[PDB]
Write a protein that binds this ligand. Structure first.
Ligand code: MTV
Ligand code: MTV
Ligand code: NA
Ligand code: NA
Lengths: 415, 415
């Protein structure tokens, strides 16, 4: 496999729409390389439990279906994996907190494409299969049929990203983009859509992209395949995340009468808005309400307009399919009396991020509170994120050097 | 207002469908009393942003619309309020854990009723108003239009409960039943449906049924009305709850070689399945996987059939609109080495119940882990639930008698 993660500061600083060059990459195997001259002839087959199976070329999609341009936040299931790895080593690429990127995606509605084949009333799922050939054969997975037909979910088949034709690494020439759901279901190099009454039976649907129960050890999961065949553990909708980006790791700030603007981003699954983002400087004893900016709502408020030949119709939805940004000003004098900054979000289902880590075999969907340690050094404060992408230098490295237990009630820090 | 809560043991023991006589009751004011002879003439007006406003009598609903019979779990937003009251006294009826009841509801689809009036493309909400007249005028609130049109959500206008004509306390002759959403939105004695592009402006929509941010004090909420006018804090979909019912409060069990079957129920909002229910006997250090029974899935598997003149079509949905039951056998010898039983659920969005209480002004949607204390007395164990409905006798009463801080890292219990 191949994985690349943008620097957290660069991701935040780029703002609501991440440049294509910075978008994170996750490939299970070799990328199928498709030359520009072959793009328009790329063919997808629609089959299974449908009245009228058909095949369609990209050029035909572009001419025959309504075209949309939609901002969507993509998130890898493995985001924040390194934090879990610090607690107990496991398999998988050690993502920091920047395994997410947000783009305008241009293409057709998957529901329109499937609708044309007329799915059976007994159908429940749409299987998706890619043209790639990683170690265990073609990558494939699935999504609920009803979600494809739901305008609030805006599931797309995209052929442009921020108005550019897709790069090989991002699925050239065609991929599914599934908002509010882990990147694992957004199948790249799309070849086949199969309408079914049951989930995918693809190897990658079983043995990846699952949050196994916490008490299942890696040895149990290796020795008993049944752990990977219970749909209750398959990841679809994202869980709620909030990340601190300012102050930056190892940032040093002089203590003064000035306020400092703590800041970051949040995202969530299933189109459910994050209703509140709260910060604590006293280890969760009291919480302060951050100001949230939802840039997607600006697109919602603009009504209908076109970008890259596609209709922007955020205005037709109430869902939140993109990340939001948050800010909170605090006096430096208060930070100087604090040992850490914690952030947590609660959504419009009144579900909140947990205090407690949920360690699991694939170390996926790690959404316990993100913590930035505060170290006072003379008349200045220095700040430490939990982990750094690809290097030491976070508070978890320090706590391990101190002999501490990161899972204890004080994050392994002394008293 | 008037509130009544069934005994927790009786609620559990009754099983998947709660008898009408045991169903919890929540009225904000006097109940409008409607004689049997007046039922069929009861009229509802459909108005607002629609092409064709109309009025319809109950008898006409019964003859003109498709009739369904659907199991739905109802839950009061105030369930588990007494637990919060033990921490810091607040306003509101002190619910234990049994402010929930599950019934077969018979009636028409709200989406069919609204669909007939042809809502404007700009419409976003359906306001609902009741015939009652509590202190601040007619009770009214709202629900998203798109949710009314979604078959997975099965929002109904019901006139029978477990096959009986509705009782006055339960909305006779007609109410809305909104699955997966707090009982507050399931408007009783329904008189008016108004299609709008914005939320309800009813007094009860603002000043009740909200989870205000935790740092907002009762004094802040009393003095600044704006806290109650931000939709991000209005409750719709339920959050995830799991409750221990066995062992019962003050139950005493002889320590032996025998296993004991710990047991209870769970429920969740938005039709999202609870994928796992986990129990800890070691204060969250390790977790054990419970067995979950989902009786709704039996109705799903039965295909189409009729109950009380209504189509049962659970088979058409994938959503979970009802509670589930859970069981876990443990050796009594292991319980004897333990100081408590904790239970928590995680749903199919990989969102888990929190360790930390989220105290709030209305003390609503309290879903931190439910804890049963274990007290060893000679060769026996005695068990204590957090609180008892209407009386002392739980571990929270005991912890307060001990001078402890329930919000501390050990639930206020010694070391
Ligand atoms: N055909 C195909 N092969 C893949 O390996 C494959 N991996 C995916 C995963 S697994 Mo994760 O939930 O472990 S994030 C993620 C992404 C990321 O897309 P990007 O590289 O365009 O960011 O595409 C998904 N789609 C795929 N499609
Ligand atoms: N018209 C009307 N008046 C009410 O006071 C009223 N209260 C409700 C609340 S507020 Mo809560 O989220 O504070 S639970 C709940 C229920 C309960 O219905 P039941 O009495 O049939 O159990 O109906 C809701 N519907 C109502 N409808
Ligand atoms: Na909220
Ligand atoms: Na789950």
């Amino acid at each position: 496999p191949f994985n690349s993660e943008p620097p957290l500061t660069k991701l935040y600083d780029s703002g609501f729409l991440t440049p294509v060059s910075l978008h994170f990459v996750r490939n299970h195997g070799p990328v199928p390389y498709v030359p520009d001259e072959n793009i328009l002839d790329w063919e997808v087959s629609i089959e299974g439990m449908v009245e009228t199976p058909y095949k369609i070329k990209l050029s035909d999609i572009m001419e025959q279906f309504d075209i949309y341009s939609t901002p969507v936040t993509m998130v890898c299931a493995g985001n924040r994996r390194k934090e879990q790895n610090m607690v107990k080593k496991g398999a998988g690429f050690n993502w920091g907190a920047a395994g997410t990127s947000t783009s305008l995606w241009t293409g057709c509605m998957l529901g329109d494409v499937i609708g044309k084949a007329r799915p059976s009333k007994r159908a429940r799922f749409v299987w998706m299969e890619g043209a790639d050939n990683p170690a265990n054969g073609a990558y494939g997975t699935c999504i609920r049929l009803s979600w494809c037909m739901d305008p609030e979910r805006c599931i797309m088949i995209a052929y442009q990203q921020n108005g550019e034709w897709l790069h090989p690494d991002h699925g050239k020439p065609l991929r599914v983009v599934i908002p509010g759901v882990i990147g694992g279901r957004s199948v790249k190099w799309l070849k086949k859509l199969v309408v079914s009454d049951r989930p995918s039976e693809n190897w990658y649907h079983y043995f990846d992209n699952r949050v196994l129960p916490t008490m299942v050890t890696p040895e149990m999961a290796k020795s008993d395949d049944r752990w990977w065949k219970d749909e209750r553990y398959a990841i679809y909708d994202l869980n709620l995340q909030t990340i601190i980006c300012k102050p930056e790791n190892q940032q040093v700030i002089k203590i003064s009468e000035d306020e400092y603007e703590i800041a970051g981003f949040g995202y969530n699954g299933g189109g459910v808005r994050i209703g509140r983002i709260e910060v604590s400087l006293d280890k969760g004893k009291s919480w302060k309400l951050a100001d949230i900016d939802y840039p997607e709502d600006r697109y919602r408020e603009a009504g209908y307009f076109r970008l890259f030949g596609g209709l922007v119709n955020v205005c037709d939805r109430m869902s939140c399919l993109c990340w939001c940004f948050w800010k909170l000003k605090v006096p430096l004098s208060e930070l100087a009396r604090s040992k850490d900054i914690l952030i947590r979000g609660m959504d419009e289902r009144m579900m909140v991020q947990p205090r407690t880590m949920y360690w699991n075999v694939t170390s996926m969907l790690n959404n316990w509170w993100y913590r930035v340690a505060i170290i006072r050094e003379g008349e200045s404060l220095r700040f430490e994120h939990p982990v750094v992408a690809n290097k030491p230098g976070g508070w978890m490295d320090r706590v391990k050097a101190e002999g501490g237990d990161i899972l204890d009630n004080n994050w392994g820090e002394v008293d």
